Amino acid sequence: CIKKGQILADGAATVGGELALGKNVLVAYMPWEGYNSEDAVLISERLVYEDIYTSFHIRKYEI
Amino acid sequence: NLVFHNKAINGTAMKRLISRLIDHFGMAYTSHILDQVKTLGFQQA
């Protein structure tokens, strides 16, 4: 049963009725061999192979 | 032939040294010294 105004489906970047634009990840703040010089980040491969940050992009070409 | 330093190095001090080394040894030697100090700094940090 649903009452008027209640949620039925969720859109992209939304989970359970709230805005969700990113992910939660384990992080440490420390210097590492210069890879982080200035403002650069070093990341693990888990993010690549477990698909935490993958996105779909669609383009249109017309004539 | 270099001085032995027993006190801390801060940014002002490194500029003075790079300057002093450029005058005594020249730009070529100084470039190698610089790459080596970089490695040591990154490793310790």
Binding site: - | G26, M27, A28, S31, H32
Partner: protein
């Protein structure tokens, strides 16, 4: 003799730092840098005009410079070119991160 400098010496030769040191020696004999750049450019052109097909992986500018150093007594390879002794096989590329 400092005891453990072997790797640094291998690298200086391999990296191409040798060329940098050489350019500096040679400019210690000259009042105008701009003229020396012009002299080297001319020699390179003569070399390529005379034997065109040698060059392409061997560069003429490098040849002129190696020839100067060898004339003055420091052994340098021709065109500062070094082979990779340990390459796995044909069609294999080193990852110089």
């Amino acid at each position: 003799r400092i005891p453990f400098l072997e790797e640094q010496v291998r690298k200086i030769r391999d990296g191409g730092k040798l060329l940098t040191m050489d350019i500096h020696r040679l400019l210690l004999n000259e009042d105008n840098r701009f003229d020396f750049v012009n002299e080297i450019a001319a020699e390179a052109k003569q070399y390529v005009e005379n034997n065109r097909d040698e060059y392409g992986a061997k560069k003429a500018i490098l040849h002129v410079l190696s020839n100067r150093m060898n004339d003055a007594g420091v052994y340098r390879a021709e065109a500062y070119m070094e082979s990779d002794p340990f390459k796995p096989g044909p069609g294999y590329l080193k990852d110089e991160l």
